[PDB]
Amino acid sequence: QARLCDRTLYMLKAAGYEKTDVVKCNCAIAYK
Amino acid sequence: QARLCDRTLYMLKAAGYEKTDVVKCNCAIAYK
Amino acid sequence: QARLCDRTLYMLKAAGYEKTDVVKCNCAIAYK
């Protein structure tokens, strides 16, 4: 599914993130 | 357009970067 | 070929990594 490396996440709330933390969506990567 | 997360940028000079700072180009990501 | 930016690598053993360090494979990015 998803993978959190340091501050960057390669589900959002599952790892403590929210879509105000996503930084890119391929048509994701979240960061905080 | 572009998005700078810590040291990594997901325009270059707009955010203080130059192409000697890009690290990948999908056919970008800059880092310093 | 490959490019190591801080903790993130955009060959594995060439830069001191192993596939237990890869975090994404586009069909790579390693991290430690």
Residue numbers in the entry:
A (entry chain D), B (entry chain D), C (entry chain D): 19 to 28, 60 to 76, 120 to 124
Task: Please give sentences taken from the publication describing this entry.
We found the recombinant Tv-PSP1 structure, determined with X-ray crystallography, showed unusual thermal stability of the quaternary structure, associated with a disulfide bridge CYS76-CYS104. Each monomer of the asymmetric unit is part of one trimer formed by the same monomers from different asymmetric units. With respect to monomer folding, Tv-PSP1 maintains an antiparallel/parallel mixed beta sheet in order 123645, with two alpha helixes on one side, and the trimers form with closely packed beta sheets. We determined all structures through crystallographic studies: two of them (Tv-PSP1 A and B) have a single disulfide bond (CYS76-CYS104) with different B factors; another two (Tv-PSP1 C and D) have no evidence of any disulfide bond; and the last structure (Tv-PSP1 D) has a partial subunit due to its high vibrational motion state. Monomers C and D, with broken disulfide bridges, have high thermal stability (high average B factors) with respect to monomers A and B, which each contain a partial disulfide bridge. In the disulfide bridge, we observed a differential occupancy between A and B monomers with a tendency toward the A (75%) conformation, although the functional meaning of this is unclear. In other L-PSP1 proteins, the central area of the trimers contains a reduced cavity. These data suggest that the disulfide bridge does not function to maintain the trimer/fold protein, so may be a functional characteristic of Tv-PSP1. The structures show a potential second disulfide bridge between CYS18 and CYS101 from different monomers of the same trimer, which did not formed but are in close contact; this requires further studies to determine.
